[model samples]
Target: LSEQAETLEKLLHHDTVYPPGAKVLEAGCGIGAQTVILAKNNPDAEITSIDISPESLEKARENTEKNGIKNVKFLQANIFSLPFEDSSFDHIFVCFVLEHLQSPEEALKSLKKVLKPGGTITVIEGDHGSCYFHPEGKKAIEAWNCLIRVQAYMKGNSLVGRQIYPLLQESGFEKIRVEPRMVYIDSSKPELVDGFILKTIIPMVEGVKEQSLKMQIIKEEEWEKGIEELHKTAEHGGTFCYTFFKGWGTKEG
Candidate 1:
């Protein structure tokens, strides 16, 4: 949470960068990391947060209340079908959520319905496209990517990183802009790898363990071997990295 706060603070540097008094909408406000930051930074402008998970919304609301900030509202809703009138927001923010959607392009379009004319939208995403491990970790990364590809296909999203720029154009957004950030993961670097495997991949694998078992995509014995191989690589100081891509555009009035 502290790291995320720092990240959001850097991105939201309050000193006169964005338009003041711009009502902002945060989509997929998981745990309210950015929502809290934005609410604090732009107190005059209403910052409404929307999350698909009710629990997440509730937690975010609690966080907002704890901070004693009265400028933000958190709602539980689906992005594909937001429950708001047209032209309700001056800025819309979506980060790290597109890759999880089945119809990402359509979702972008849906956002336009409630966005004011010429409103700005900010988006951040990572495709795991540049994800690769050091030579010692290569084999395991390959297997991981294989699983990612299959999962992405199942969920109607591509795990590849480079598709976002083109997808944004296809979504009918004009004056599109993109920025990509890449960080190489060195298991030796605790800060970079902190909570990565445990927070992301390991849990993801655990979540799908039942499916893998039923589909026979991987035998239990092979999965165990893969886990052991990963442990060995980590012990030997292996490296891994994931690339992030971000884009934002406005609906031309």
Candidate 2:
């Protein structure tokens, strides 16, 4: 979690800020890694970070207070049914919560209910489907597809990153804007090759290997081959690319 945030800090939080005194909701603030970033980036905003577990909130509070951050309040809540009254928040920042949801659109609709009229929402999600690497590592690509299937088996959407735009519009968000933040890495930038590919991407898929096996998505040998291909992509002269879709929407009056 720390490595993912550390390597993608600029891509994720560089421009994320809220107006003075804005009431912000950060839904599903797991461990408050993003919470710390949000509070640090927008010191003036009053942030309400919510999660499903008290233990997670406990850790989140520990994390923020340890960082001397004072702009956030932690709440134990679920996005499926937020406890706040309608139009309670001025804006919201949802990162990485949608893909795990069975109904991401419903999640958005629920979020909009607590969002004030004209409030803005920013959501970010990544697409493994957008991943491509040099030498066209066939097994590496298969591994990604394997993970996608595993997520689907768990009733989540690994490819939902590209659906943010249409999902927002369909959920009644007006003036929606969406963009793909591309992550392209090669040997030329060793930091990204190591930070992004070696640490973040490889580990992410590797962590799911057991699930993929249980689901019978790929055999052990093939899975190992794919993982090796991923490492090769991080080698000298190797290249990689992935896309993260960022969407902004406005709550209609």
Candidate 1 residue-wise lDDT, 1-253, digit = tens:
5344444354333331246678888888888776777677777887888989999888888888888889888888899999999999998887667878887888888987889989978777766556665454444553465567567757845453466677778877889977766655566656545455435544454665556667667767666666555555344466666666667788888
Error of 1 at 12 (Å): 10
lDDT by residue (145-166, candidate 2, tens digit) is: 8878888888989899999999
- List ranges where model 1 is wrong by over 4 Å: 1-17, 37-44, 66-69, 136-139, 146-150, 158-161, 197-201, 231-236
TM-score of each: 0.80, 0.96
Checking candidate 1 for backbone clashes, the offending pairs are none
Candidate 1's error at 9, in angstroms?
A: 7.4
Instruction: Report the CA-based lDDT of candidate 1 relative to the real structure.
Output: 0.69
Find the number of clashing residue pairs for candidate 2. 0
Question: Which candidate tops lDDT?
Answer: 2
